[PDB]
Amino acid sequence: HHHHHHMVHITLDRNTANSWLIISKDRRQVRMGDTHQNVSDNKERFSNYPMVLGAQRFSSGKMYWEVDVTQKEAWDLGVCRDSVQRKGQFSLSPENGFWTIWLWQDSYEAGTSPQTTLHIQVPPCQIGIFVDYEAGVVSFYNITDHGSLIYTFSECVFAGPLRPFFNVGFNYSGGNAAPLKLCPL
Ligand SMILES: CN1CC[C@H](Oc2cccc(F)c2)C1=O
């Protein structure tokens, strides 16, 4: 792909994070802590899952960024509406304001309702995410496999400002402690 020139510098918003996440000083890395991270509760925090939003809001234009997922067993990545539900249980779907893919139990799936099987021959270590607000497109690229397309959501109905969306995945297994990292431009 030739989307690299729409690169944007994403930083994580501490205030949206689940209370067990640890965000690095530079706001470019996030990982699951082994306990509550000693922060106050607020209405922005995701309560049920280890999720956090980027600080940036997008309402026009073309945007591209990359995330490092090396050695993780589980994660969700993409964009969401600024007004998505934060508390309680919910599915990642466009109807709920999410445009996402994920890894879970050795399979990759797109967050459609119901979910769509992805066909990945080379397990990605870094994922590229492209958003075209006007066109209604969210695309995912396999940076480890020369930028090969993973999945395109088209005819998206964003219906609001978008924020970068992250889930570090649960760590019940002891094999999913590694961070999500925003990769340099
Ligand atoms: C080993 N464990 C136990 C808790 C953590 O999972 C979570 C993460 C966020 C919210 C939540 F309610 C639970 C995990 O991966």
Swiss-Prot record:
What induces this protein's gene, according to its Swiss-Prot or TrEMBL record?
A: Up-regulated by IFN.
Taking every annotated instance into account, which residue ranges of this chain make up the domain B30.2/SPRY? 8-185
Q: How is it modified after translation?
A: Autoubiquitinated; does not lead to its proteasomal degradation. Deubiquitinated by USP4; leading to its stabilization. Autoubiquitinated.
Subcellular location, record wording: Cytoplasm; Cytoplasmic vesicle, Autophagosome; Nucleus; Cytoplasm, P-body
Q: Taxonomically, which superkingdom?
A: Eukaryota
| Chain's role | E3 ubiquitin-protein ligase whose activity is dependent on E2 enzymes, UBE2D1, UBE2D2, UBE2E1 and UBE2E2. Forms a ubiquitin ligase complex in cooperation with the E2 UBE2D2 that is used not only for the ubiquitination of USP4 and IKBKB but also for its self-ubiquitination. Component of cullin-RING-based SCF (SKP1-CUL1-F-box protein) E3 ubiquitin-protein ligase complexes such as SCF(SKP2)-like complexes. A TRIM21-containing SCF(SKP2)-like complex is shown to mediate ubiquitination of CDKN1B ('Thr-187' phosphorylated-form), thereby promoting its degradation by the proteasome.
Q: Which family does it belong to?
A: Belongs to the TRIM/RBCC family.
- Describe the protein's quaternary organization and the partners it interacts with: Homotrimer. Component of a SCF(SKP2)-like complex containing CUL1, SKP1, TRIM21 and SKP2. Interacts with CALR, CUL1, FBXW11, HSPA5, IKBKB, IRF3, SKP1 and VCP. Interacts with SKP2; the interaction with SKP2 does not depend on an intact F-box domain. Interacts (via N-terminus and C-terminus) with DCP2 (via N-terminus and C-terminus). Interacts (via C-terminus) with IRF8 (via C-terminus). Interacts with ULK1, BECN1 and with ATG8 family members, including GABARAP, GABARAPL1, GABARAPL2 and MAP1LC3C/LC3C. Interacts with TRIM21 and SQSTM1/sequestosome 1. Interacts with IRF3.
Any notes on this protein's domains?
The coiled-coil is necessary for the cytoplasmic localization. The RING-type zinc finger is necessary for ubiquitination and for the IRF3-driven interferon beta promoter activity. Interacts with SKP2 and CUL1 in a RING finger-independent manner. The RING-type zinc finger is necessary for ubiquitination of NMI.
Name this polypeptide is given: E3 ubiquitin-protein ligase TRIM21
Give the shown range, full length included: 291 to 468 of 470
